[PDB]
Design a protein around this ligand. Structure first.
Ligand SMILES: CC(C)(COP(=O)(O)OP(=O)(O)OC[C@H]1O[C@@H](n2cnc3c(N)ncnc32)[C@H](O)[C@@H]1OP(=O)(O)O)[C@@H](O)C(=O)NCCC(=O)NCCS
Ligand SMILES: CC(C)(COP(=O)(O)OP(=O)(O)OC[C@H]1O[C@@H](n2cnc3c(N)ncnc32)[C@H](O)[C@@H]1OP(=O)(O)O)[C@@H](O)C(=O)NCCC(=O)NCCS
Lengths: 1021, 181, 92
């Protein structure tokens, strides 16, 4: 989308990236004055303001400031300071827009005559670029197309200064003729290198010292940043000069920024009655057009869209902002909310309606307090259940809600709302039943949609011969041919696909914008491909004009650049046109009709399929050409392609505002070329260049024998009239409705709409990852971090699913700090060191150390808890317990050490014992274990209570003595192994430390020498 | 048991699951010390056909974001002095979400670039230590030790629900054997 | 029931071109288990069937068995056998 850039950034890009030998002047001499700017930093940063003469002018995309008189001319620093006092912060009025003034640009004032100022303007058209030059520039030129010398430089070609002198500088002065060619050639090279669209240097002043550029205007193709962000830098695209944005409008702008959908809102009238929250691109302009054409020009409140399947939270925010904007004012005649839309492609209608009715139930009180009337029209998949949900909320709340579906005309909903009616060479046969395509890329949804269409249209051969993807190797994707399961080969390079499949002639380009150009330029040199459909979006206008040029050379037709494709019922379907097989079977697009149509946007193609289906005998071949600026094939090429086919009997065309193409339709039908009955309507009149607008195209086509309705309410009526005339004349013979083959639907779609009931394994009462917030045990992650529970708190949530108290969470952190590394001598740390010295990696080193924590290493954390808790719940005195574990063998687990005995404590069992005796309420099992250790220290002094026994008995005591465990979960976790989990999660820090440390000392492979082995092999087995 | 169940879960933390923690630090710090713009780093990374590690997620998007990325960002803005690599990574993230909404800067990329910031912009690591601890693999250990709590929680939960042996039904398989070998 | 009467649809992951366990015989790569035992191929033959999905010739099968015989134990000094001894001595 080519959009405008400021004069400051235009002069900045010009002065920085121009490549000329001519004397450029005033390079990087401009100052930006805001309402918020100071003057000391301005004088320190730009000293020439205190040395030269100044010209100050507002740069807010103001066109023709000389004809308005907002330019400060030839002033000092105090001159511009005294002149900018009624200019900074005052709502100026430019054209038909009164808006704030908040931006000014200061240039060094130059001396110039009337015969020094010229006019240079390079603007891009479809064939190439127009370099327009005039030897008499300025503001009072007037006729911008009736005097100046133009020069069309072709695409992928350069402009030579000898050509500039031959065609462009015939009437230039002779003392400017040598430097002007160099400046114009450098300006064209900079234009072509920075991907501009329209660069207008007026008025240019070439004098004896050099070249001055007084005023500048520039539009740059904003989607060329992936090729020129290093040259642009931080481009600040300015909004057009108008009123400041409402905070709700800026809120929906922020939603569109941080969303993945398109969420547009613009409040034309914050007091009026007609609010329109309509999903779709062309749906919003069609609904606003039939609001304007039914007397609702002045009282139309807002216009905008929520297109491209927004999330439930995002559509709730958008509908909440609309229902809050229609609430603050009161209208006693009545407010009308048109929640419109066309037929959706793949979105479940009930989910978007769930978001909107959440926003409606949040505003039911004000919505009944302000006398609203809600009119809903929607189509697509599961629109029956969606409109039934909306009717349920209209019954339960009490507000008037009127739900209409595919059976209704698209904008008769606003007819029955305002009180107007009661409420109830290139080839021709591109696609054939032997046409096999080549998809480019992983787009398995679109390929399965195409294969479902090829099954249901009674076609015996799949229309995907092979897919092509170079980022993975050759393999065979699994796809569904009806009930059957087939393998479709995805090839790495296109050479293998065009070798093994020489029957293909169409490549569907599902590459992204960073590979679509290279992919279709690789494609276009293959001889069998005779048409190319590029479904991507974001491709720049320069690259798509090079695509148009090489398509016209190689003779392929292109239906690429921003489209959904186009469906020929019975033969072929390009990706996701039509939608699901529900839409294909409801709009009867499985058998060939007799009508062809052309559209520009892909959002109104579904409404065209619906209208021609409900009012005719079908669609023969329909094509949407794309939502780009220079489409790969315009309307006239497809109308000429329809003319040579023996199957078409009438042609519908849906045009739009901008671009002179319906005039080519007029000239083609008038010059004896078109015979079959053309019906057309140019959408988006809504004007509340004036020679190419929609009312101009309507008044031009209405007289020229083209059937043109008055509004969009009557398009199906006109098409039905033309069809019943054509069946009265006996040319159209409608065939019999043969029943199609049937496909099974989908497990995902059937569970989404809810009629399958499959039993689900993996019960998992922990960590609900889905939804919008990562929910732990029952508590969200934001509450986990807000309530300041540490990793002991999340251990209590993940493992035990309880909110543990703050002493117990800190105790679990204490246990995971003492059961960290305990030296590399031990078995698990030794295994981790051997795997790290064999150079393995972190997860195999830590993992092959962790497969020793069984019974003899790391088993005293759990054995000394099961022992001390079995022999405490059986009611045994500590002396009887010590003697009972004496007569049965069975050394007491968790009691013993090698050095630290008594009057020489363990000094990490003391920290845990201090914490437990200070913080734990009612700890009986630690006191029992301390009685046992006091009995058994009399035998040997080094029979102190081990840390592996103290963590066991303190953990069992914590579980069965703190809150929220009863006593039967409090030893279920002991039986399951929460203590083994505590030791393994603690010692994982030590094992990862040993891996990193043996990786950091750069140790080699270990061999364990034969001096420490002593083989004891048998004699001869 | 605990060590075999947790361990057979930990032997999947590779490159596609959870081992992007180190590659989303090596890549983002190899394209910051050879300083390019994000809009050319993405172009180079697509041109080479390799995945920008720590920028993609299967189930989360910009219309369905994961909140754990936001909890770390609101900590590393405040208590972290001078973290430029995170700003670089957020730039690359929004460059890629302008094209596809699926590709969202993971926690496995945010922890990688925030750990490179915490190593090279806090004290005690000069420049050879703070790059040795990226080359050795001290950032995968953060994910493995963090996810051990989740895997032990899943072992304890499936042990407490008393669930049976898993069998994975044949309607989810589609055997694609040769003809007669 | 909705897939037994054949109406729903399901995309199935896990493509596995080896060892169809269903049916009345445990089929390997393409060869049933009775053909595996009647053709007198050793464990090298089923290594060729499961790993490579080709019925390898009978000299390559004996070579695969010869490789699995020489790449058996090579003393417990080496690091993998040493880790196995440490985990067995921890009694796992
Ligand atoms: C005989 C001698 C060697 C025994 O010394 P010792 O320290 O008792 O060594 P032991 O292994 O027998 O001690 C183990 C005791 O602790 C107990 N014990 C050991 N580990 C235990 C554990 N985890 N849990 C509970 N109890 C444990 C044992 O059950 C045993 O207690 P018991 O008597 O009730 O059975 C010692 O007395 C000695 O040195 N005699 C020589 C002195 C002499 O005459 N010198 C010559 C003169 S110059
Ligand atoms: C984890 C991962 C498999 C999820 O991605 P995904 O949702 O499955 O996306 P898909 O692989 O299905 O789709 C592939 C398309 O998206 C692109 N893409 C997907 N992930 C990408 C990534 N991290 N970086 C760059 N491109 C990516 C592919 O290049 C391809 O482009 P195309 O449209 O031109 O064909 C992938 O993003 C990845 O490997 N990321 C790095 C590892 C990681 O960070 N894991 C943490 C999250 S699990």
């Amino acid at each position: 989308s080519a959009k405008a850039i400021s004069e400051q950034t235009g002069k900045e890009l010009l002065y920085k990236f121009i490549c000329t030998t001519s004397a450029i002047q005033n390079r990087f001499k401009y100052a930006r004055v805001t309402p918020d700017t100071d003057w000391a930093r301005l004088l320190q940063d730009h000293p020439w303001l205190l040395s030269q003469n100044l010209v100050v002018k507002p740069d807010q995309l103001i066109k023709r400031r000389g004809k308005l008189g907002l330019v400060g001319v030839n002033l000092t620093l105090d001159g511009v300071k005294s002149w900018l006092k009624p200019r900074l912060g005052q709502e100026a009025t430019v054209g038909k827009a009164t808006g704030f003034l908040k931006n000014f640009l200061i240039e060094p004032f130059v001396p110039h005559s009337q015969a020094e100022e010229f006019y240079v303007c390079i603007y891009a058209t479809r064939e190439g670029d127009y370099v327009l030059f005039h030897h008499e520039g300025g503001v009072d030129v007037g006729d911008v197309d009736a005097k100046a010398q133009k020069l069309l430089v072709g695409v992928d070609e350069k402009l030579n200064p000898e050509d500039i002198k031959k065609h462009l500088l015939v009437h230039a002065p002779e003392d400017k003729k040598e430097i002007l060619a160099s400046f114009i050639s450098g300006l064209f090279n900079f234009y072509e290198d920075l991907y501009f669209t329209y660069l207008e240097i007026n008025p240019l002043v070439v004098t004896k010292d050099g070249v001055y550029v007084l005023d500048l205007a520039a539009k740059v193709d904003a989607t060329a940043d992936y090729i020129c962000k290093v040259k642009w830098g931080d481009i600040e695209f300015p909004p057009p000069f108008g009123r400041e944005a409402y905070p709700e409008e800026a809120y929906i702008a922020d939603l569109d920024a941080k969303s993945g959908a398109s969420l547009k809102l613009t409040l034309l009238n914050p007091k009026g009655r007609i609010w329109t929250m309509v999903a779709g691109g062309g749906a919003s302009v069609v609904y606003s057009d039939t609001i304007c054409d039914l007397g609702g020009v002045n009282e139309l409140a807002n216009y905008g869209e929520y297109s491209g399947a927004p999330s439930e939270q995002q559509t709730y925010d958008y509908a909440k902002t609309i229902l809050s904007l229609m609430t603050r004012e009161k209208h006693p005649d009545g407010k009308i909310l048109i929640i419109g839309g066309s037929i959706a492609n793949f979105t479940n209608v009930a989910a978007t309606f769930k978001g909107i009715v959440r926003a409606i139930r949040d505003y039911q009180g004000p919505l009944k307090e302000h006398e609203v009337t809600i009119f809903v029209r929607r189509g697509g998949p599961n629109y029956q259940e969606g409109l039934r949900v909306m009717g349920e909320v209209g019954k339960t709340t009490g507000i008037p809600i009127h739900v209409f579906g595919t059976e209704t005309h698209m904008t008769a909903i606003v007819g029955m709302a305002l009180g107007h009616r009661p409420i109830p060479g290139k080839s021709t046969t591109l696609f054939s039943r032997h046409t096999k395509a080549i998809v480019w890329g992983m787009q398995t949804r679109a390929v399965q949609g195409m294969l479902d269409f090829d099954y249901v249209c009674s076609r015996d051969e799949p229309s995907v011969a092979a897919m092509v993807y170079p980022f993975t190797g050759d393999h065979k994707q699994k796809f569904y041919w009806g009930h059957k399961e087939i393998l479709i080969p995805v090839f790495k390079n296109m050479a293998d696909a065009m070798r093994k499949h020489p029957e293909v002639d169409v490549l569907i380009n599902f590459a992204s914008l960073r590979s679509a150009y290279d992919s279709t330029m690789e494609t276009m040199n293959y001889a069998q491909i005779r048409t190319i459909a590029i479904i991507a979006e974001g491709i720049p206008e320069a690259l798509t004009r090079k695509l148009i040029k090489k398509a016209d050379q190689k003779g392929v037709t292109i239906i690429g650049p921003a489209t959904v494709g186009g469906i020929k019922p019975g033969c072929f379907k390009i990706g996701n046109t039509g939608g699901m097989l529900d839409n294909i079977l409801a709009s009867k697009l499985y058998r060939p009709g007799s009508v062809a149509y052309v559209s520009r946007s892909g959002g109104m193609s579904n409404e065209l399929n619906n209208i021609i289906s409900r009012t005719t005998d079908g669609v023969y071949e329909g094509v949407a050409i794309g939502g780009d600026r220079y489409p790969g094939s315009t309307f006239m090429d497809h109308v000429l392609r329809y003319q040579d086919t023996p199957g078409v009997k009438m042609i519908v065309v849906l045009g739009e505002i901008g671009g002179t193409e319906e005039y080519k339709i007029c000239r083609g039908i008038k010059e004896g070329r078109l015979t079959k009955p053309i019906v057309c309507w140019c959408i988006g009149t809504c004007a509340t260049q004036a020679s190419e607008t929609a009312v101009a195209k309507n008044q031009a086509l209405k007289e020229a024998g083209v059937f043109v309705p008055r509004s969009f309410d009557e398009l199906g009526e006109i098409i039905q009239s033309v069809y019943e005339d054509l069946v009265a004349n006996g040319v159209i013979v409608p065939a019999q409705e043969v029943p199609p083959p049937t496909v099974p639907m989908d497990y995902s779609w059937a569970r989404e709409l809810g009629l399958i009931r499959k039993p689900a394994s993996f019960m998992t009462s922990i960590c609900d990852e889905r939804g919008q917030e990562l929910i732990y045990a029952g508590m969200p992650i934001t509450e986990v971090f807000k309530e300041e529970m540490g990793i002991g708190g999340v251990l209590g949530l993940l493992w035990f699913q309880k909110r543990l108290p703050k002493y117990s969470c800190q105790f679990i952190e204490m246990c995971l700090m003492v059961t960290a590394d305990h030296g590399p001598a031990v078995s698990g740390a030794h295994n981790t060191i051997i795997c790290a010295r064999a150079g393995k990696d972190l997860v195999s080193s830590l993992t092959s150390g962790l497969l020793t924590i069984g019974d003899r290493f790391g088993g005293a954390l759990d054995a000394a808890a099961k022992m001390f808790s079995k022999a405490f719940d059986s009611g045994i005195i500590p002396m009887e317990f010590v003697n009972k574990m004496k007569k049965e063998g069975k050394l007491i687990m968790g009691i013993g050490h090698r050095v630290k005995s008594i009057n020489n404590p363990d000094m990490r069992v003391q920290i845990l014992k201090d914490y437990v005796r200070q913080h734990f309420p009612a700890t009986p099992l630690l006191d029992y274990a301390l009685e046992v250790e006091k009995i058994t220290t009399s035998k040997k002094p080094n029979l102190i209570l081990n840390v592996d026994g103290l963590i066991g008995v303190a953990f069992v005591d914590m579980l069965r003595n703190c809150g929220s465990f009863t006593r039967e979960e409090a030893d279920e976790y002991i039986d399951i192994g929460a203590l083994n989990g505590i030791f393994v999660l603690g010692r994982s820090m030590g094992f990862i430390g040993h891996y990193l440390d043996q990786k950091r000392l750069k140790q080699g492979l270990y061999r364990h020498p034969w001096d420490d082995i002593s083989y004891v092999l048998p004699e001869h087995m």
